[PDB]
Design a protein around this ligand. Structure first.
Ligand SMILES: NCCC[C@H](N)CC(=O)NCCC[C@H](N)CC(=O)NCCC[C@H](N)CC(=O)N[C@@H]1[C@H](O)[C@@H](OC(N)=O)[C@@H](CO)O[C@H]1NC1=N[C@@H]2C(=O)NC[C@@H](O)[C@H]2N1
Ligand SMILES: [Mg+2]
Lengths: 117, 109, 103, 54, 142
RNA sequence: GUGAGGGGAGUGAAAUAGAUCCUGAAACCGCAUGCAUACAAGCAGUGGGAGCACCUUCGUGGUGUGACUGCGUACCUUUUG
RNA sequence: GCUAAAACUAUGUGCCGAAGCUGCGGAUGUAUACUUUGUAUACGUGGUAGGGGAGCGUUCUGUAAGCCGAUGAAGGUGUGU
RNA sequence: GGGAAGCCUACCUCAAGAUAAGAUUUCCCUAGGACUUUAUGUCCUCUAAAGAGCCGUUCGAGACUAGGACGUUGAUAGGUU
C-alpha cells in the first residue's frame, strides 16, 4: 500500500501561498518564507485585537477632553461631574456627541458643572 | 486584429534581445525597419527577420495595407538551454549555459 | 431626532429607520422589541438627559434576523518551544431596525 | 569577496534601469532620396552629390 | 464604524498670530504644539492633520529663567570626525531666533511625515511684522 | 539563406494532439491593464484609515490598490539564557 | 523643555492606566441534581520534557456484476460557501 | 572693565535637493470646432516658439560621462606656406 504524497502536499502548500497573497517578494512566492509570514501575521492579529480597544478608548478620551475644554472644563472634572450626576453614558457615545452635536455636548457639560457645584 | 510571427530557437540571450525589442516597441513599421537596418546589434537581424515575416503574413493572409501597420505587440521569451562543461584550473569544472530565446512580433492597424 | 440605548453590554446612538447589529438576542425574527431604559433623547433643541434614564421615553425596534460575522483565525506560537495551536471563531449577532422613538 | 544575501529581482532591475539602447542619427539623402546614416556615405556609394563606384 | 475619522478634504485650518514678548519658551511651545497638532478640536484624529496655522511675532523677545540664557547649549554635528559644533541661547536668540522655536516645537511634535507636515504651519518672525495679512489671522493670547 | 522558424491552406472529434507531440503543477523569466511610489530610515506585517479605478443588486455593497498612523528585532536547534 | 516647577517635603480632591475584576455573546472539562436524557447550578480551561483522551485526510481489500461518469472521471486552475 | 597660539568672525574653496528648492536681467508662446464627466474636462483640426539635444571637426577637458570651442555668414582639426 504505497502512498504518494503529491496531491495532499500540493494542496497544503497552495493554501498557505493563497493566504500569503499581497506580501512582498519571496513572502508571496516561496513556501518556506510565506509560511513564516502567515504565522507572524496571525500572532500580530491576536495581539492587535486587544490593542484596538485601548487605542479607540484613548481616541474617545481625547475628543471628550477637547469638547470639555471648549465648554470650560477638563476631562477629569467632566467625568467626575457626570458620575456625581448619575449619568451613565459611555465614552464612545460621549465622543460621538462631542464630534457631531455641539449643543448636546454643551448641555452635558452644563449638567456636569451643576453636579460639581 | 493583430497578425503574429514567432521566431523560435534564436541563438541569443533573451536579456540581450529584449533591448532591441524595447527599442522598436510601439513604433510604425517603416521607422522600426530603419532602426533595425542601421543597428549594429546581433539581435537586430533576428528581430528584423521576425518583423518582416509578420508584415508578409499581414499582407498575404489578411490583405492589410503596409502603410497603416505598427508594432503593436512584441516580447521575447526564454528558450531551451544547451549545457556544456568548461574545464577550469587545478582540475575544477564549471557548467556553461548556452541560452536561446523566442521572439514574438504582432503588427496591427 | 436620535436616542441613546443600551443593548448587549454596549450602547448605541440611533435614529429612526436605522439598521444596526447587536449581540445575539433570544427574540424571534419579525418580533418587536421595546427599550424602556433610554439614556438620552435629543429633538434638535429639546434635549433630555436621563439621570440614569429618561422617564417615559421609549424606543421601538423590529428584529430582522440572526447571523454570524466573518471568520476570525486565532493563532498561538511560542518560538523555539515546540508549541502551536489554532482555532476559528464567528460571533453571533442579531439585526435590528429602529421603527420608533418617543421622548 | 561575495554577497552575504542574494540580491532581489527589484534591485537587479533597478541596476538595469540604465541599460536602454538609443537611436542612431538617420537622415534622408537629397541626391538619392534614401535613408542613410548622417555624415556617412550611403550603401550605394553616394555622398554629398558625389558617386564613388562607377 | 460608528466612530468616524476626520477627512482631510473637510479640515479647516484657521490662522492665528501670537506675540512672544515676555513669554516662557517651553510653556509657550507646548501650547503652540498642541494647536499645531489639533488637540483642541473635537474632530481630532491621530493620522490626520487637523491643526491651525500659528504666526509668531517678536520671536527674539522670548525668555528663559534661571541661568539658561548663558548655560543652555545647542549642539549639532557635521558628520566629519571631530565635527561637533556648539552655541548657546544668548547667541542663538540674537542671531537666528527662528531656530530656537523650530527646535522647541519640533521636539514636541511627532517624529514622522505627519509631524514634518504639521510643523510647516508655524511661521516665526523676529520683528513685529509678518507678511501674511492676506490670510487675516486672529490674535491668540497664549 | 532552397537554412532554422513561422502565418495561411488541408487532415483530424480535438493541432494550445504537429513530431522530446496525453495531462502540463512550482521555482524562475516576459508582455498588458488598474492603483501606489523620487523629503523619506530598520524582520516588510498587523490594528486603523483617506483617496483613486472598475463593477454594481446604487449601499451601511463587491473587487484591486493603499497616502497617513499606533504596535512590532525571522524560523529551527541547543541552552541558565 | 522645566525655577512662586513640569524639582523636593506634607496634606487632600479627581482622573488615566493591564489579556486583573465587572458587563454581554459563545465553546469546552469536572462535579452535583434531573431518579433515560442533554437540561440547570457550582468550580475550572498559560504551559517545555512528559503522560492521558478524541479526531481529519492519503493508498489498498471486502461490502461492489452495486452507485457516479463522453449530457464529461481523475488531475490542474479560479470563485462561493 | 581688562584678559590667550583656544571659541565666533576674518583668509581660500564648495554651497538653494537650503523640498524653507531663494534673488536679478533679458527672451518666447495670445488658434478654431464637437461633446458631457461643466472641469487647469475628453476627442478633432491647425500650430511647433524662445531654446535643448542627436550628428560632425575637436580640446591645454576627460576612464565612460560631464565641461569648453567651432560647423561654410567657418580658422574647429588635418594639410599647405
Ligand atoms: C584530489 N587528488 C584532488 C582533485 O580531485 N583534483 C581535481 C579537482 C576536483 C574538484 N574538487 C571537483 C570537480 O571539479 N568535479 C567536477 C564535477 O564532478 C563535474 O563538473 C561539474 N561542473 O559538475 C565534472 C565534469 O564532467 O568534472 C569534475 N572534475 C574533474 N576533474 C578531472 C580532471 O581534471 N581529470 C579527470 C576527471 O576526474 C575530471 N573531472
Ligand atoms: Mg589536468
Amino acid at each position: 500500500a504505497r502512498v504518494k504524497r503529491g496531491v495532499v502536499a500540493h494542496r497544503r502548500h497552495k493554501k498557505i501561498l493563497a493566504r500569503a497573497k499581497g506580501y512582498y517578494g519571496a513572502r508571496s512566492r516561496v513556501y518556506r518564507v510565506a509560511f513564516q509570514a502567515v504565522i507572524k501575521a496571525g500572532q500580530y492579529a491576536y495581539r492587535d485585537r486587544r490593542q484596538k480597544k485601548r487605542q479607540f478608548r484613548a481616541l474617545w478620551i481625547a475628543r471628550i477632553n477637547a469638547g470639555a475644554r471648549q465648554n470650560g472644563l477638563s476631562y477629569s472634572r467632566m467625568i467626575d461631574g457626570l458620575k456625581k450626576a448619575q449619568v451613565i453614558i459611555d465614552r464612545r457615545v460621549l465622543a460621538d456627541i462631542a464630534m457631531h452635536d455641539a449643543v448636546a455636548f454643551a448641555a452635558l457639560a452644563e449638567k456636569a458643572k451643576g453636579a460639581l457645584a | 486584429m493583430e497578425v503574429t510571427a514567432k521566431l523560435r530557437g534564436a541563438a541569443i540571450s533573451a536579456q540581450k534581445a529584449r533591448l532591441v525589442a524595447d527599442l522598436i516597441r510601439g513604433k510604425s513599421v517603416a521607422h522600426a525597419l530603419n532602426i533595425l537596418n542601421f543597428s549594429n546589434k546581433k539581435a537586430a537581424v533576428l528581430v528584423k527577420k521576425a518583423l518582416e515575416s509578420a508584415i508578409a503574413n499581414a499582407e498575404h493572409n489578411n490583405s492589410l495595407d503596409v502603410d497603416d501597420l505598427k508594432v503593436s505587440t512584441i516580447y521575447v521569451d526564454e528558450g531551451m538551454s544547451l549545457k556544456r562543461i568548461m574545464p577550469r584550473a587545478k582540475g575544477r569544472a564549471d557548467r556553461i549555459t548556452k541560452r536561446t530565446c523566442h521572439i514574438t512580433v504582432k503588427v496591427g492597424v | 431626532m436620535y436616542a441613546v440605548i443600551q443593548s448587549g453590554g454596549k450602547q448605541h446612538r440611533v435614529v429612526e429607520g436605522e439598521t444596526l447589529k447587536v449581540e445575539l438576542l433570544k427574540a424571534e425574527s419579525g418580533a418587536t422589541i421595546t427599550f424602556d431604559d433610554v439614556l438620552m433623547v435629543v429633538n434638535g433643541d429639546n434635549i433630555q438627559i436621563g439621570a440614569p434614564v429618561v422617564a417615559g421615553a421609549k424606543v421601538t425596534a423590529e428584529v430582522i434576523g440572526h447571523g454570524r460575522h466573518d471568520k476570525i483565525r486565532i493563532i498561538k506560537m511560542r518560538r523555539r518551544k515546540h508549541y502551536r495551536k489554532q482555532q476559528g471563531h464567528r460571533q453571533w449577532f442579531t439585526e435590528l431596525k429602529i421603527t420608533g422613538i418617543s421622548g | 569577496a561575495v554577497q552575504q544575501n542574494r540580491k532581489s529581482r527589484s534591485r537587479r532591475d533597478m541596476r538595469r534601469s540604465h541599460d536602454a539602447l538609443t537611436e542612431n542619427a538617420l537622415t534622408v539623402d537629397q541626391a538619392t532620396g534614401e535613408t542613410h546614416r548622417r555624415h556617412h556615405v550611403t550603401k550605394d556609394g553616394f555622398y554629398r552629390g558625389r558617386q564613388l563606384f562607377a | 464604524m460608528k466612530t468616524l475619522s476626520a477627512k482631510p478634504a473637510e479640515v479647516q485650518h484657521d490662522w492665528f498670530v501670537v506675540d512672544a514678548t515676555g513669554k516662557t519658551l517651553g510653556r509657550l511651545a507646548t501650547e503652540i504644539a498642541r494647536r499645531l497638532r489639533g488637540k483642541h478640536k473635537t474632530s481630532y484624529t491621530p493620522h490626520v492633520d487637523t491643526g491651525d496655522y500659528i504666526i509668531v511675532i517678536n520671536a527674539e523677545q522670548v525668555q528663559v529663567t534661571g541661568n539658561k540664557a548663558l548655560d543652555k547649549k545647542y549642539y549639532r554635528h557635521t558628520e566629519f570626525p571631530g565635527g561637533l559644533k556648539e552655541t548657546n541661547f544668548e547667541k542663538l536668540v540674537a542671531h537666528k531666533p527662528e531656530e530656537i522655536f523650530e527646535r522647541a516645537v519640533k521636539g514636541m511634535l511627532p517624529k514622522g511625515p505627519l509631524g514634518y507636515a504639521m510643523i510647516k504651519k508655524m511661521k516665526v518672525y523676529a520683528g513685529s511684522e509678518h507678511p501674511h495679512a492676506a490670510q487675516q489671522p486672529q490674535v491668540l493670547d497664549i
